[PDB]
Write a protein that binds this ligand. Sequence first.
Ligand SMILES: Cn1ncc(-c2ccc3c(=O)[nH]nc(CN)c3c2)c1-c1sc2ccccc2c1C#N
Ligand SMILES: CSC[C@H]1O[C@@H](n2cnc3c(N)ncnc32)[C@H](O)[C@@H]1O
Lengths: 305, 625
Amino acid sequence: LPPNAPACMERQLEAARYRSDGALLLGASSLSGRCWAGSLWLFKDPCAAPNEGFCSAGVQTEAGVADLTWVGERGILVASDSGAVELWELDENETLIVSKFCKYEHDDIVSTVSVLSSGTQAVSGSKDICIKVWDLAQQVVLSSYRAHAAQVTCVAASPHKDSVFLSCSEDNRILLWDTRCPKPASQIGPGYLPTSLAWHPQQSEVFVFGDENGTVSLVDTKSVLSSAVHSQCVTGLVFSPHSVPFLASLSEDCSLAVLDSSLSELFRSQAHRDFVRDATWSPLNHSLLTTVGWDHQVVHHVVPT
Amino acid sequence: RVSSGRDLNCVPEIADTLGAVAKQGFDFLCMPVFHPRFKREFIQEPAKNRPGPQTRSDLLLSGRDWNTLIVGKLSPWIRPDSKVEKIRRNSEAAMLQELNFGAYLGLPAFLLPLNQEDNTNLARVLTNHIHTGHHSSMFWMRVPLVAPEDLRDDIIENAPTTHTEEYSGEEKTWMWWHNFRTLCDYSKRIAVALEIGADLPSNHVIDRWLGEPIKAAILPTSIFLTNKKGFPVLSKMHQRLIFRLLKLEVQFIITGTNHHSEKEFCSYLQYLEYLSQNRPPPNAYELFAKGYEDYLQSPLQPLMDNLESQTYEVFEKDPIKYSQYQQAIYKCLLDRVPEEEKDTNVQVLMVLGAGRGPLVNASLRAAKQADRRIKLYAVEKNPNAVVTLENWQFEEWGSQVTVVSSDMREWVAPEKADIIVSELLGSFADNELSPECLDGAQHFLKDDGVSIPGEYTSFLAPISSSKLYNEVRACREKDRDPEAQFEMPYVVRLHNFHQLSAPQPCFTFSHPNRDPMIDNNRYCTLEFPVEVNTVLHGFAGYFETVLYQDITLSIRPETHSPGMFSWFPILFPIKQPITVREGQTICVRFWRCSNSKKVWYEWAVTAPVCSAIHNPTGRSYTIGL
Ligand SMILES: Cn1ncc(-c2ccc3c(=O)[nH]nc(CN)c3c2)c1-c1sc2ccccc2c1C#N
Ligand SMILES: CSC[C@H]1O[C@@H](n2cnc3c(N)ncnc32)[C@H](O)[C@@H]1O
């Protein structure tokens, strides 16, 4: 029950991300009821989540949390229902979560946010169909790009190229970006709408994306392997931190899947009773995999390696 | 005073949000009735069993506030025309759910998007909801002037933007709307919320929406410019489009976030109020015509019907019209009576259809300013108005006026007239049977006599107006042909419409008609060049008349008598809309038909497609003799 921490956490858990030391960051939205807001949480004990009385820090946002990500070790970057991108920062003591800035640069819900290699810039995608590049230090939009023709479902920064990132949209485009190019977007070639994206951690020009029909696909920049992993939308794809990484996939089918190099299934969890929203691998125990969903559960799966 | 609303996609608290939206000066709030990210499953477990509540409570606003302040919004994940079957199913169930909640709440309107070409299944679900009870709610289809694909930044290196003109392609979103409302069978509850972008399309793209049922215009904060002082404003081209929209009295909607953070948010709205206050106030006619806009009226038949008192009043409240009659008479008197005969030559003037006396007084004023002598007869068949004429004649006119209570086709005049003056014209000129009436009176005009008016000509012009088409459609009555409403003309102050070609002359009549073989039947074929893609719904009718020499009356727009209020245009509809492409010719055919008891019109389109002959044998509409 830390100070200025809400006594109640919203039901619909939307994000979960481990940091270096293993503390767990939670993002929650209230998607029904009188008040439609959200909240941010830090659990230095990931087994105590999502219990509010045994958290390390917590704060309320003005609106819901559609996405978030760490910015280093004390920064939290939030995509808000309000159209705004927010940055919060832990205090020196890590007992409060203070707002750093709140800029209303999108004209609709901010659905997806991603921090670039340098850790000083981030990219965001919105239902307003725009993608914006942010200078977190100057708290200003550097660039605003309207490449797509419909909502932007996912943006994902390159692991090691500070000027490269992927995006996908309901216009059925997957775009590879390189801000060094006069026209910085390139279309990566009829299928079903792309819903999720994940760079390979150890391979520069390799990524995976999920579609609205349950398919997971492995793509190279230039010549395709795919598998029906889910019976509904693929909400997210998160590679493990192993030398040869595993691939965790999430779905509105309320199941978690773990796939190998060839997209074959090694694990399957049906613990959730509602949509599975995020998955984050423990930095300490590489076999443990944490998931959160709209059933308000925080599950700790042991993934057989 | 502009009626404006605020568009939000994020409402943490309804009472807080509504209060803030009103303090800024808005009249209503477009907002979601379920959280726009709260995707719901209706078929597969375990997610279909997600415990509730499924959204906010109706008890958070009073019934009046739901009824008047809230416009609902379809959740954006709802995609009934998805290519994924599971998604089409859940979207169908969800769309019925949200729509039925809106109805549950009594919302005055509900917003659904047209953001792609194929909305067949969306239309099917909406049409099903519409046929599930009898409610008055409106559906605003959010459709942009310019599709997002046609305005994206040219920043894809391997998919450049088309820089070549695609006339019809640029009109694609109008086709999104046309097909949707055609599938939904022109429901009256389905209307357009036109969304305006930062760059306007070619003018023809804009004009495509003329005649359509635009109930709202949506202005993103992204399109506003910034003046020196830092306030949001609009380009001169956008201001042009705003003014056109104020003429349609649409509701304006402000969407997006505040990008002029230096100024409070009511800035955007205050600018609209600024544009609204800046425009020519009601200019007599427009001042008076407003209220009658696109209101269908049965054409008067003063021959078969006896007009009421307040109907003559409307005729009389137009001094520019009678001052023209006075000038026509003034000039005629001087051409017929040389100065040297001014005291000996008494001209016999007959007003044929005098009503309550306006021409009689104009005739008296004319003889005074002309310094000539006249002997007046005032002929009126409506005995109710003859009451007015005879109290006038006893109280003021005296013996210089002889009131005659009779039909001018039967009256046995005691002497012949030097001038007959008449006001027997309708909005289509001859549609009250002025030719038949003046032919039957000709026998008592002198051999050199003058008729005022001396000739008249009807005009026609093709028009597009899905709004007016629907208004006619809704004129079905219980005990008659269910398509009779389309086989009859209407007098109407045409407003929300698109004129498709320059009006051209139809039927002309001259008086006196010296011809020995008088036949007032008529057959005319007209060819209208059309330079736009459009839909044909009917023909606007006007007329011009020569009162004498250069003195005229006209409601034909290009020659409209300035300052004259009398006579709205007339509308001839067609049963089925006709598609017309750029560069095609509309050929229409009109007949004027008659027997001993009735006169009527029949009409037909013969290019680019044939319609049915409308009003054959006057089965739906006749004018009584
Ligand atoms: C429906 N109808 N058909 C024909 C008319 C209409 C109008 C105006 C005149 C005129 O100033 N003079 N003579 C006629 C005929 N001879 C006339 C006929 C009308 C009417 S009722 C009316 C009442 C209030 C406002 C407008 C109108 C209006 C028109 N336009
Ligand atoms: C001002 S509208 C025309 C007027 O002419 C009158 N009128 C129309 N037809 C005739 C007719 N045949 N004989 C006499 N008055 C007529 C009508 O009753 C009305 O007052």
